[PDB]
Amino acid sequence: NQICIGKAIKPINGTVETVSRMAKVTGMKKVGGERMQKICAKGEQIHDSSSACGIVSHHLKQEGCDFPFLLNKPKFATTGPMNTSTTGFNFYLTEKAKSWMNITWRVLGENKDFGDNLVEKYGESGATSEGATLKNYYWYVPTAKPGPVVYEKLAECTGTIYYGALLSDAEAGYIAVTGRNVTERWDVRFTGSSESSISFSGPKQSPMEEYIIKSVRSSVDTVRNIIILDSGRVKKGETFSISLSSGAVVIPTIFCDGDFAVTPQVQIDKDCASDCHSAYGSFPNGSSFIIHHSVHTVGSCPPSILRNFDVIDGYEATWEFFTGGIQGAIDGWYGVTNHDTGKGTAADQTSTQKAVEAITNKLNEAIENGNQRYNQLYGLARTQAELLGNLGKEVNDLRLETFTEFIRLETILVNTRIIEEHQAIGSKKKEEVKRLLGPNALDLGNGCFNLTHTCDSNCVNSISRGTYTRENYIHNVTL
Amino acid sequence: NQICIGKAIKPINGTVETVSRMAKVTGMKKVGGERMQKICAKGEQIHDSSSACGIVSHHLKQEGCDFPFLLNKPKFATTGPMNTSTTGFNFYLTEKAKSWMNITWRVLGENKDFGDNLVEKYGESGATSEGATLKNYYWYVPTAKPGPVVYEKLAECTGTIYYGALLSDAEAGYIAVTGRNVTERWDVRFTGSSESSISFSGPKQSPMEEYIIKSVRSSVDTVRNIIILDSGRVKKGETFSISLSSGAVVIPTIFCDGDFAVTPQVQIDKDCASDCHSAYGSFPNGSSFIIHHSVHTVGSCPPSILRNFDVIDGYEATWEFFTGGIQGAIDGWYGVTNHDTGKGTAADQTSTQKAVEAITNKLNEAIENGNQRYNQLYGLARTQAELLGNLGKEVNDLRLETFTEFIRLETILVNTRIIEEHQAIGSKKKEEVKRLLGPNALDLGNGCFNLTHTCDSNCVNSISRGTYTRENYIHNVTL
Amino acid sequence: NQICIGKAIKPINGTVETVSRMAKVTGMKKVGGERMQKICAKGEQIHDSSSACGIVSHHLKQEGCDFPFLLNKPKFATTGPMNTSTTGFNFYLTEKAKSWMNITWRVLGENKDFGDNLVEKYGESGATSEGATLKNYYWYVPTAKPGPVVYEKLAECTGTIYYGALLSDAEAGYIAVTGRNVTERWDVRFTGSSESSISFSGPKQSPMEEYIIKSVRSSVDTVRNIIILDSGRVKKGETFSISLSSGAVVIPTIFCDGDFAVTPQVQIDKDCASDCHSAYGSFPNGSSFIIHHSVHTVGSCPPSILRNFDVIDGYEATWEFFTGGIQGAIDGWYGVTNHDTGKGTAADQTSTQKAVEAITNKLNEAIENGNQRYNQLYGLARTQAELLGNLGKEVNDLRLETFTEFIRLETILVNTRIIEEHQAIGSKKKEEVKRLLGPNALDLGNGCFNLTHTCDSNCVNSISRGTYTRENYIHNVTL
Ligand SMILES: *[C@@H]1O[C@H](CO)[C@@H](O[C@@H]2O[C@H](CO)[C@@H](O[C@@H]3O[C@H](CO[C@@H]4O[C@H](CO)[C@@H](O)[C@H](O[C@@H]5O[C@H](CO)[C@@H](O)[C@H](O)[C@@H]5O[C@@H]5O[C@H](CO)[C@@H](O)[C@H](O)[C@@H]5O)[C@@H]4O)[C@@H](O)[C@H](O)[C@@H]3O)[C@H](O)[C@H]2NC(C)=O)[C@H](O)[C@H]1NC(C)=O
Ligand SMILES: *[C@@H]1O[C@H](CO)[C@@H](O[C@@H]2O[C@H](CO)[C@@H](O[C@@H]3O[C@H](CO[C@@H]4O[C@H](CO)[C@@H](O)[C@H](O[C@@H]5O[C@H](CO)[C@@H](O)[C@H](O)[C@@H]5O[C@@H]5O[C@H](CO)[C@@H](O)[C@H](O)[C@@H]5O)[C@@H]4O)[C@@H](O)[C@H](O)[C@@H]3O)[C@H](O)[C@H]2NC(C)=O)[C@H](O)[C@H]1NC(C)=O
Ligand SMILES: *[C@@H]1O[C@H](CO)[C@@H](O[C@@H]2O[C@H](CO)[C@@H](O[C@@H]3O[C@H](CO[C@@H]4O[C@H](CO)[C@@H](O)[C@H](O[C@@H]5O[C@H](CO)[C@@H](O)[C@H](O)[C@@H]5O[C@@H]5O[C@H](CO)[C@@H](O)[C@H](O)[C@@H]5O)[C@@H]4O)[C@@H](O)[C@H](O)[C@@H]3O)[C@H](O)[C@H]2NC(C)=O)[C@H](O)[C@H]1NC(C)=O
Ligand SMILES: *[C@@H]1O[C@H](CO)[C@@H](O[C@@H]2O[C@H](CO)[C@@H](O)[C@H](O)[C@H]2NC(C)=O)[C@H](O)[C@H]1NC(C)=O
Ligand SMILES: *[C@@H]1O[C@H](CO)[C@@H](O[C@@H]2O[C@H](CO)[C@@H](O)[C@H](O)[C@H]2NC(C)=O)[C@H](O)[C@H]1NC(C)=O
Ligand SMILES: *[C@@H]1O[C@H](CO)[C@@H](O[C@@H]2O[C@H](CO)[C@@H](O)[C@H](O)[C@H]2NC(C)=O)[C@H](O)[C@H]1NC(C)=O
Numbered sequence A, B, C: 001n002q003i004c005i006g007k008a009i010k011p012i013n014g015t016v017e018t019v020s021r022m023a024k025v026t027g028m029k030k031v032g033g034e035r036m037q038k039i040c041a042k043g044e045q046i047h048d049s050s051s052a053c054g055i056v057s058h059h060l061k062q063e064g065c066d067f068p069f070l071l072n073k074p075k076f077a078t079t080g081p082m083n084t085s086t087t088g089f090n091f092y093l094t095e096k097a098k099s100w101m102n103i104t105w106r107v108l109g110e111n112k113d114f115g116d117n118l119v120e121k122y123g124e125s126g127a128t129s130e131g132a133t134l135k136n137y138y139w140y141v142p143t144a145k146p147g148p149v150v151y152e153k154l155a156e157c158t159g160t161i162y163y164g165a166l167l168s169d170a171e172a173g174y175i176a177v178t179g180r181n182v183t184e185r186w187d188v189r190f191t192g193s194s195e196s197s198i199s200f201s202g203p204k205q206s207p208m209e210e211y212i213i214k215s216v217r218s219s220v221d222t223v224r225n226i227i228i229l230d231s232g233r234v235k236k237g238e239t240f241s242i243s244l245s246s247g248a249v250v251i252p253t254i255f256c257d258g259d260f261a262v263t264p265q266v267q268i269d270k271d272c273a274s275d276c277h278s279a280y281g282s283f284p285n286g287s288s289f290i291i292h293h294s295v296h297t298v299g300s301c302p303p304s305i306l307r308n309f310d311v312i313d314g315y316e317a318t319w320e321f322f323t324g325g326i327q328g329a330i331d332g333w334y335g336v337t338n339h340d341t342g343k344g345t346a347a348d349q350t351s352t353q354k355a356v357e358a359i360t361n362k363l364n365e366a367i368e369n370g371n372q373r374y375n376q377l378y379g380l381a382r383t384q385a386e387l388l389g390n391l392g393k394e395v396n397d398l399r400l401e402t403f404t405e406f407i408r409l410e411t412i413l414v415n416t417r418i419i420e421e422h423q424a425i426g427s428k429k430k431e432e433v434k435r436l437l438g439p440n441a442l443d444l445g446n447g448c449f450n451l452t453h454t455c456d457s458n459c460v461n462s463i464s465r466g467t468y469t470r471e472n473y474i475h476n477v478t479l
């Protein structure tokens, strides 16, 4: 009789978008992973000191508040608010100091110390009885006042340094310590990778009057000392300089850049593990992209996007009289039949696995291209702490918006390439049958052949393995 | 004889650009609307006070200059230049104050007042005889000088606040009012969503000497008072603070953000109406995009672009021996003929209307995509006043340049999709005829069939409605 | 017998990337030019004063250091480091001054002078014996001190102006010159296209103490004068103002913007010429794009990119029983044969030259589009000096990264268009032969015809120039 080849009919599932049209497919999936409803923290440590410490207390090494000086640092931390009192002095901070101290207290790297150099250069530090419980500071009080100097040093890592002043609100103490006159203004300047400065004057003058009013009082109500801070930045291989006068203060530590821990905001669950966490949940194992609105994460995580897209997973449906589909039931994507159901239908295997492999190859290439584009956009030598510190109070990142469009543009090309490859694979099989049958059989030109003799089920399945021969089927003639 | 189907030949009009080639089409149009030569302002109000007021006079509520305190505000306004004198004090402004006052005097929203809170907190305001014609200011003069304080308040909308000082150039008055010494420097600071400050000193010192020289004199030549201003920004839900000392001044009003009117620059015409206006003309009704170089407009207007593009409006011309065109005259885009003119040609209707609808569908989808991209680029909660205030003196916007390329990229995809859809529509009609005629008629494979018998005009037009039958045409045989 | 037409088989060279697939081609090239290992400077002048001058000495017109006051300026220059001493005063610079003097000393344009206006407005300049070897400065010392003034002037070009102070470290000299008190602070302000200021006080006070310590000493060890500088910017058509008090100093010259020379970093070679040079080498003649990481160059150079790409140069290979290739040896890209080698094969010429011209046309259009995009990105009225001055210490430019992706996107479209045009050219030739042979010869449908009679070598080459006739080949019949 006659034989035909083609695909197997399956119900339609969805539609995808290509360059020139919309296609109907029997299966599709997504590229991104979705957030969970909890945090999986099996085999981890959690640090919590929300009842005793504050943000400032950690920097100054108060008694019992020493997160940044530990050998092993947990990846989850929580502490009190920024306006929490201490047990030593009263303190005042500027806006930049607040912005950088929101981050610098929980870095996961190593910190550098240079107090001994100052001690050996200028002698012993000043002493007071109101700071018995604090350790990390250096007070410059020379014998001859004011005696300005300039201190220069070569840095070791990239990070931030805090500097400022420490003064009392009594006029007699101010005159005895500074050695200046009340009706004067004097500055402290920091020059590094950038430039910064701060100004001071007498107690009953500007701008010290505002500092006294805006300060945060301490637990002990008999403390008369206020310390005012500000920040500056350094670089690894260069030299930084500070101008010093009698009365200035500096914290002798460099907080090197790196990664910082996250603060949980949802319920914490044990007895389950993962490898990528955020402040609002975890993510599934082995993902290629993450649906997130920032770049702050702990663990090993892929890049981030703002929304999700669809990618083909099956094959296109092109059918409704032969049209290209086979009504039989077969365990494959391609088949050969002779208008018989149950025994007159057979399936091949090579085309199925080739079509399977094409998708994986194309998807891997697209993922690699996306990774390279991300690296170009953000740079090879990047640090999360610096990236989030530079943003400040802004919650919108333009680079994420720029990156999101690239994936949307790439998905269409991926779909088009996959479909064209499937068509190319399908085209070749039709040629291997025409040359195999010979030139004595006519072809309908629509994938269905029509043979000179009768072709039974064995005739059909012998073609599938390709061991077909013409010698034993010559008998009888029919059209 | 034989019959053929195809399109109708029409003269060529232009060319369009697709992904892979340039196409020749019989009709095209544009996406953007062009500016007019005048302003259509029928049924509108125009405000003009160019002969009496100035920009500063409006903020201080001078006698007869009260634009920002009206229930109904017109959409067109004009006033005098910025260096126009007043009838009260002498005044001095900084650069930021000038930049923001170029806009804040003509907002179309609501303004908030908080003078009563200050009055009930610190008592009555200071009094002088040189400001009898002004109302909108508060002067802080306590009994004990200087007496610094800090004032904190929770805001209601998002906007700008002006603050500064008011002093005389006589030494005795300065000492009597401020209560300080001449050889001193004192500051006023504003902290909100950002930070700002300003400094003052005695009359025969810096920087007051420059303030005296650079000031703008008043109409009355016996005024000895200069008021110096500066600006700051607030946010809706947060708290803002001001540092006050004896002698400072603040204008107790918040100018909320929103839209502001335009100043006509061309001839104004009545007796004609529109719904979108700019400073250089109006735009036609019902446009989808606007050819304009800014985002400042009044009314209901679509997004803006920097140049214009072309979009297909007819069908592609593919012809020069049959080639695919019909030389007859028909009232449609598709037809059937038998090499006869006048009576041997007929036209169908379904294909024409389907091809008509495809263009509308594709164009609507493209427009929606463009709107979504614009919203992503600029943000959902946006205000024109803030957007133009942040730019400053720059006249080039990069976001418009980024947005312009997106439309150019989208137009090519639109054209490609439309052409492919037209080809898909055309392909199906050829199949419905082969199955209708039957298997006893050969096909030339180029859209022309060739029938076994003679096929007259009734034979031709019966096919058009699809009521063709084979029983009554069997007689005679010819090839 | 039978005849066939097609291409000529050549070995495969490489692969290129298109919209929907990867193609195999017999030839390809690149779009960008690569750097050399030296500098070609035949017929050029080189300036070198690394042994006597410094950067600061050039601005002040020291004896023998006068680069910015020459009629003809060489395109290569080199001088000493920034901290080189002079023979006059001691000097101090800020960060912005350093950043701008890294560039302004080697501009190739014209500079403007306005000293005579100052002389005629305020009289003769101050005189000192420590600056006998310097000429380019103006010192304001009026008879009555301090006597502040404001100086306003309309500019001529766009550029930078340096201003500041000149003072001694002795208390008596300070009091005698300035006419102020030691416990005071006074400022100098510059308002133009932007705003800037600087502050000064007494010798044993802040911030003069830091200035004295950080200064650079002069060759003569008996000089007691320090000059402190800062910078400001102007615009062509506007007015700029300066606040002056007794003791200020200004350099009366405007350094107009333009191009500046390069400093060689590699070996310099004569006896060879080019037309585009950089600091690390030269580039080949007649290039369309340059592989560079900046926009600083001298000569006539095209735009710059960060990496290189591939562009097709031959024709696609589509073959492995005829498949479309001819095994004969021909001097062309297309040919006709009759399964005979040596004398039964001929080549045409028109198709070859048409295919050659298509590539040139498409490439030229792409290059023009790229040029227009570059002009849109950077602006029509641009200056290298201003562009690099605004960047500062940053070594990464985002606009180059944005521009690099455009070329990568354009190359794919170029390849697709070229391939489609080649297919369109190839398709038409097959039609001109079917109509020429007539309707009495069958066609195999794969580019090979099959004729009713025998067709020899003269028969083959008769088709080549198209003068074939059917009358003399009618004899005999065969299939
Ligand atoms: C010290 O530094 C810390 C680190 O920077 C500071 O932490 C930030 O604090 C902010 C104040 O609380 C906080 O902002 C909040 O964010 C919350 C986010 O949770 C929401 O959950 C919703 C579902 O329940 C989401 O719908 C919502 O938005 C979505 O986010 C998706 C990503 O998961 C997007 O794909 C979606 O499009 C969707 O919309 C986005 O919203 C973003 C804003 O959240 C927006 O930027 C983006 O463009 C999309 O439009 C969101 O996920 C909100 O519920 C709160 O209302 C509030 O906005 C920051 O997130 C904190 N930063 C980080 C990195 O977590 C800390 O404040 C600082 N300390 C001090 C004292 O300043
Ligand atoms: C208070 O705030 C106000 C609001 O910001 C300030 O108003 C601005 O004042 C500026 C100074 O006058 C003014 O700049 C002028 O703009 C005019 C524009 O008119 C021109 O008309 C020509 C035809 O006759 C056009 O060819 C020309 O440019 C075109 O614009 C098309 C859009 O319509 C573009 O599609 C074209 O490409 C073309 O070229 C553009 O030109 C733009 C500059 O105009 C350029 O930015 C863009 O990239 C294209 O290259 C233009 O339309 C000019 O004639 C004047 O020469 C001058 O440039 C601003 O437009 C005002 N702002 C607004 C929003 O109108 C006000 O100054 C301020 N007060 C104070 C004291 O500062
Ligand atoms: C006054 O102004 C001057 C002008 O701005 C200042 O000159 C700058 O001085 C810098 C300090 O020396 C200098 O930075 C150096 O650049 C060198 C570049 O030479 C390298 O050669 C290598 C081959 O041997 C390349 O591999 C290397 O990088 C490549 O560059 C290619 C372009 O040729 C790119 O296509 C490649 O991708 C590749 O990688 C790039 O590197 C770039 C950094 O160089 C990077 O920005 C880019 O994104 C790519 O990643 C490079 O070509 C280095 O060897 C040195 O290590 C150092 O980085 C600047 O180049 C100078 N500026 C100019 C315009 O030349 C001068 O400092 C200033 N005076 C003062 C006192 O400040
Ligand atoms: C997701 O990946 C994590 C990898 O950290 C898996 O956690 C490990 O699972 C293996 C397999 O049982 C255990 O031997 C390890 O002890 C686990 N790690 C830890 C730290 O306990 C986790 O099982 C994976 N989850 C899923 C669903 O596959
Ligand atoms: C453009 O649209 C405006 C919409 O404001 C039209 O103005 C209105 O036109 C209708 C129809 O005559 C009138 O009844 C209204 O009174 C008009 N509005 C006002 C405020 O007077 C305008 O006619 C339209 N123009 C064109 C050419 O269509
Ligand atoms: C590259 O172009 C330069 C153009 O400046 C060529 O230099 C000129 O070459 C011509 C031809 O011999 C000479 O007559 C000129 O005198 C050269 N210019 C100078 C300034 O000497 C150079 O020869 C070209 N190089 C190549 C390899 O083509």
Ligand SMILES: *[C@@H]1O[C@H](CO)[C@@H](O)[C@H](O)[C@H]1NC(C)=O
Pocket (backbone or CB within 6 Å): A001, A002, A450, A451, A478, A479
């Ligand atoms: C194909 O074969 C079937 C049965 O053998 C026959 O009915 C049909 O006419 C054949 N078709 C052609 C085109 O020969």
Ligand SMILES: *[C@@H]1O[C@H](CO)[C@@H](O)[C@H](O)[C@H]1NC(C)=O
Pocket (backbone or CB within 6 Å): A012, A013, A014, A027
């Ligand atoms: C498509 O397949 C998925 C996977 O099984 C299934 O969840 C979904 O319901 C299917 N779509 C439809 C419309 O049935």
Ligand SMILES: *[C@@H]1O[C@H](CO)[C@@H](O)[C@H](O)[C@H]1NC(C)=O
Pocket (backbone or CB within 6 Å): A081, A083
């Ligand atoms: C400290 O800050 C928290 C943050 O909301 C606030 O509730 C609390 O009132 C503040 N403490 C004081 C003393 O103002």
Ligand SMILES: *[C@@H]1O[C@H](CO)[C@@H](O)[C@H](O)[C@H]1NC(C)=O
Pocket (backbone or CB within 6 Å): A179, A180, A181
């Ligand atoms: C303070 O001023 C007085 C008088 O002006 C002066 O005698 C004294 O030396 C000054 N003190 C300092 C530390 O400068």
Ligand SMILES: *[C@@H]1O[C@H](CO)[C@@H](O)[C@H](O)[C@H]1NC(C)=O
Pocket (backbone or CB within 6 Å): B001, B002, B450, B451, B478, B479
């Ligand atoms: C088509 O019909 C016409 C007239 O009936 C005839 O001249 C021509 O040869 C026919 N073509 C074919 C291919 O049969």
Ligand SMILES: *[C@@H]1O[C@H](CO)[C@@H](O)[C@H](O)[C@H]1NC(C)=O
Pocket (backbone or CB within 6 Å): B012, B013, B014, B027
């Ligand atoms: C194309 O059609 C428009 C609309 O009628 C017409 O204005 C234009 O002249 C036409 N183009 C040509 C080349 O005739």
Ligand SMILES: *[C@@H]1O[C@H](CO)[C@@H](O)[C@H](O)[C@H]1NC(C)=O
Pocket (backbone or CB within 6 Å): B081, B083
């Ligand atoms: C005020 O500004 C205008 C703007 O051009 C100017 O013409 C006028 O001279 C200025 N008035 C004074 C007094 O300078």
Ligand SMILES: *[C@@H]1O[C@H](CO)[C@@H](O)[C@H](O)[C@H]1NC(C)=O
Pocket (backbone or CB within 6 Å): B179, B180, B181
């Ligand atoms: C001004 O200075 C003098 C002397 O230095 C002092 O007696 C007087 O109290 C000062 N006045 C004020 C308001 O500080």
Ligand SMILES: *[C@@H]1O[C@H](CO)[C@@H](O)[C@H](O)[C@H]1NC(C)=O
Pocket (backbone or CB within 6 Å): C001, C002, C450, C451, C478, C479
């Ligand atoms: C083509 O011609 C050759 C020789 O003339 C012959 O062997 C072959 O069968 C012909 N092919 C067809 C389809 O007629």
Ligand SMILES: *[C@@H]1O[C@H](CO)[C@@H](O)[C@H](O)[C@H]1NC(C)=O
Pocket (backbone or CB within 6 Å): C012, C013, C014, C027
């Ligand atoms: C491709 O052609 C170029 C030009 O001659 C040659 O240098 C290169 O080796 C060729 N490629 C291969 C793989 O032979």
Ligand SMILES: *[C@@H]1O[C@H](CO)[C@@H](O)[C@H](O)[C@H]1NC(C)=O
Pocket (backbone or CB within 6 Å): C081, C083
């Ligand atoms: C001047 O700068 C160079 C730059 O490296 C440095 O080597 C030299 O030591 C500096 N001179 C002085 C006196 O510091």
Ligand SMILES: *[C@@H]1O[C@H](CO)[C@@H](O)[C@H](O)[C@H]1NC(C)=O
Pocket (backbone or CB within 6 Å): C179, C180, C181
């Ligand atoms: C400096 O101060 C003294 C006392 O305060 C005063 O007598 C003298 O006039 C002042 N000198 C100047 C130049 O202001």
